[PDB]
């Protein structure tokens, strides 16, 4: 026409120049007659103008045009098994997100896509609706109202062509369940597209090992009600006839290992063809060829059937890949842990040939120490390399130290404050220490202990220990006399076998005893040494300082430390007096446990725990009582108090005393917990238990105090059972438990709820 200029009104988010550019007509030139069509197609090709209204005065074009309002917040109402993040993902898949304008009319198609997702779950009756909220500044909010309806169960699982061999109960091996016992209640019946796909191959696998080789599927058909309430599923198959194998052979390059594969393929004649046996056999070959140093061969297993006699001859073919070696190793995870620390568990070495087996021994040795949370191995091929290879060992670290806190809970340190801390990966080095300082304002007990497990290469261990201790509580004058004592321990440690370890070392102690009660079992010892200063005296006092020797034996074979699942760990210690000393005796303690799963898959597991304790003197003499055993404290015996177990002393009745005979165990049922997700489910452990223990002395007699009971007997057995929660937290391990005792006697005590914080399995 004749327009000379353009003005726009109602655009608050976009340039007018681009607007007038999207149409060919412009200001400063003769515009055309298509200007209305150009305004139309451009302003609605933008997708950012909801309505346009353009008019020409004769010299100037006035455009009155709005901009499509843009979404601010996308909100959800009616979520019950569905999370808004995946829904926003589905929206971005739609092509829609916050800060975008739109038509307000694809809402129906949007609802349909949402409902298609809902179909993908297994609900088809639902209905969704939008709630639009107009807002100034050309804005909107949007909310989503849902009515999910309900899903279906499955009603029958009926199968075709399954004659002459039933599975209509043996189907129960599937993921899916078309029957929920009212006496085995859990879960319900729900369909899924893919769990189907899994159980189908499962069923195939079943028939593949009972003497069949042609069990094929025709089809799989499913439908359901018009009211969409329950499903009807069917599947169409063949059943051919039974089958057998007839001989086996191979082919391909080796290094003359024919006689070994000969053993893995080895069979008896006249046996049923399988395919799982086949597969594990293949992989066993792969393991062997790992060991001799191969990674990437190829393997093929071909049935050569004769259905004329229902037999097969299994042709096999291998292609031994060209040899490899290793070049390099690299580690990731180490932020708080030095290098050279993990190589000293690699029984593999760098820069030489290779197996596939040293790798796993290293995995084991690593997961033992608990310096890592989790593990990952891998194996690459180097670029531009047929034979050179590298490796990776990744980990996730863990903070593993502690902060012990003894308060004399249960009165084995009475009213006291035992503080202290332990860490075995001290500052990320292979170095281990532990400390306590103990104060009561009259009591002292401080102790240090240290070990370098790798003083020298090849797992050479070296440890020291020291303790100072003062005890001042006989101004109570109740029991448990005043002692001061201090000493040292030193130790070597080393292995000989690649799992089993030994150690030994020495010690020196110094002891000072004061304000002895008139307790009765003591004077047994006091005759044993010699002199007897009794009447009823309390100026009583004594001293003795002694050298000594000890040693340790170790069988450790686990999947790992830090909440293991498999194997067993046992440690024995024998300690002994030595000559040139104030006394003579010897004791031994053993601590045992073993982990066995169901399958280590869902982790339905059991542990067994036991301890043994014994000791005796020499020369017809007895050992001291302060080196006695003890029990109780709800770490060793759950549902009982600290050092509150077993026999007890008198003067002419209470307050158990410890001794020299022990036999104690606890048998468990290990459990997962469904109420928490993996994120910490890896790091928590719950169980039930059933605990036994009993105690006595051999030096104890009953011919003289016989109106008082026996304590020599191994009878009078302590029994309880309960439940325990065990959970990791940044301060160390943590555990609670609640039990119920069911065999007490007199002279004893306990609690039901108990707490522990340290290192005890």
């Amino acid at each position: 026409f004749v327009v000379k200029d353009i003005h726009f009104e109602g655009l608050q988010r976009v340039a007018v120049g681009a607007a007038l550019l999207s149409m060919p007509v412009r200001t400063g030139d003769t515009v055309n007659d298509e200007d209305i069509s150009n305004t139309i197609r451009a302003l609605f090709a933008t997708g950012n103008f909801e309505d346009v209204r353009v008019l020409r005065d004769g010299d100037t074009l006035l455009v009155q045009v709005k901009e499509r309002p843009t979404i601010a917040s996308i909100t959800f109402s009616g979520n019950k098994s569905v999370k808004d993040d995946m829904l926003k993902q589905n929206l971005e898949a739609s092509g829609v997100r916050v800060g975008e304008s739109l038509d307000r009319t694809t809402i129906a198609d949007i609802e349909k896509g949402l409902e298609d997702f809902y179909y993908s779950v297994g609900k088809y009756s639902a209905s969704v609706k939008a709630v639009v909220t107009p807002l100034p500044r050309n804005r909107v909010d949007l909310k989503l109202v849902f009515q999910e309806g309900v899903s279906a169960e499955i009603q029958q699982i009926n199968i075709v062509g399954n004659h002459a061999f039933t599975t209509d109960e043996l189907i129960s091996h599937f993921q899916l369940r078309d029957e929920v016992p009212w006496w085995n209640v859990v879960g319900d019946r729900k369909y899924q597209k893919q769990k189907l796909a899994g159980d189908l191959e499962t069923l195939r696998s079943y028939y593949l090992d009972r003497g069949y080789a042609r069990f094929n599927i025709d089809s799989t058909q499913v439908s359901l009600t018009p009211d969409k309430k329950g499903i009807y599923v069917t599947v169409n198959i063949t059943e051919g006839d039974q089958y057998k194998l007839s001989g086996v052979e191979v082919s391909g390059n080796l290094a003359g290992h024919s006689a070994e594969i000969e053993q893995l393929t080895k069979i008896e004649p006249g046996e049923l063809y399988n395919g799982t046996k086949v597969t594990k056999m293949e992989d066993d070959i792969k393991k062997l060829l790992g060991r001799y140093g191969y990674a990437y061969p190829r393997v093929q297993s071909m049935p050569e059937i004769n259905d004329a006699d229902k037999t097969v001859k299994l042709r096999v073919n291998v292609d031994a890949g060209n040899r490899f070696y290793v070049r390099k190793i690299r580690f990731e995870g180490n932020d708080t842990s030095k290098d050279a620390v993990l190589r000293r568990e690699m029984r593999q070495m760098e820069g030489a040939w290779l197996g596939s087996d040293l790798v796993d021994q290293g995995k084991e040795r690593l997961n033992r120490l608990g310096f890592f949370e989790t593990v990952d191995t891998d194996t690459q091929r180097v670029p531009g390399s047929p034979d050179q290879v590298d490796v990776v060992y990744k980990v996730k670290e863990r903070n593993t130290g502690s902060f012990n806190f003894g308060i004399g809970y249960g009165t084995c340190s009475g009213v006291s404050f035992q503080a202290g801390v332990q860490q075995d990966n001290w500052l990320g080095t292979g170095y281990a220490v532990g400390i306590n300082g103990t104060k009561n304002d009259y009591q002292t007990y401080a102790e240090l202990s240290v070990t370098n497990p790798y003083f020298t290469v090849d797992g050479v261990s070296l440890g020291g220990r020291l303790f100072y201790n003062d005890f001042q509580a006989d101004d109570a004058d109740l029991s448990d006399y005043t002692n001061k004592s201090y000493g040292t321990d030193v130790t070597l440690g080393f292995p000989i076998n690649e799992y089993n370890s030994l150690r030994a070392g020495l010690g020196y102690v110094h002891n000072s005893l004061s304000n002895m009660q008139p307790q009765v079992a003591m004077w047994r010892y006091l005759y044993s040494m010699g002199e007897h200063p009794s009447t009823s005296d309390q100026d009583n006092s004594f001293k003795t300082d002694d050298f000594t020797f000890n040693y340790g034996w170790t069988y450790n074979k686990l999947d790992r430390g830090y909440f293991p699942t498999d194997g067993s760990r046992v440690n024995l210690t024998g300690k002994v007096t030595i000559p040139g000393s104030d006394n003579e005796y010897y004791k031994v303690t053993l601590d045992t446990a073993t982990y066995v799963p169901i399958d280590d898959d869902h982790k339905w597991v059991v542990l067994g725990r036991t301890r043994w304790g014994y000791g005796d003197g020499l020369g017809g003499k007895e050992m001291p009582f302060y080196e006695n055993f003890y029990a109780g404290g709800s770490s060793t015996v759950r549902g009982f108090q600290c050092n509150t177990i077993g026999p007890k002393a008198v003067y002419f009745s209470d307050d158990a005393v410890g001794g020299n005979a022990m036999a104690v165990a606890s048998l468990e049922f290990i459990t997962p917990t469904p109420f928490i997700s993996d994120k910490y489910a890896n790091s928590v452990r719950t169980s039930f238990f059933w605990d036994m223990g009993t105690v006595w002395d051999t030096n104890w007699d009953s011919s003289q105090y016989s109106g008082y009971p026996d304590y020599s007997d191994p009878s009078n057995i302590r029994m309880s059972a309960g439940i325990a929660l065990q959970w990791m937290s940044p301060l160390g391990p943590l555990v609670f438990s609640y039990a119920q005792p069911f065999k007490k006697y007199d002279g004893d005590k306990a609690e039901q709820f108990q707490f522990n914080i340290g290192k005890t399995w």
């Binding site: 070049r327 029984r347 070495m349 030489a352 390399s385 047929p386 090849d458």
Partner: protein, 83 residues
Amino acid sequence: RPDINQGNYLTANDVSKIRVGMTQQQVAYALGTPLMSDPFGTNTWFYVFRQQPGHEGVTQQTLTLTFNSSGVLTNIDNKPALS
């Protein structure tokens, strides 16, 4: 107590396939790579069969080779066993 291997494997009849006037690639297809290789000139290669198992007992073979600019041999040296 520990065990160690180190070096390049041997077939010991591979050795009966070695003739001067043969490209390095022929030995590549023969062996796979070497690992020790002169970073001071004199195009040459090394091949060794060391192992140290047991509290005692030690062994090592060696073959040591030098070639032309052509990536083809000039001369060898079999040290079958250390001393």
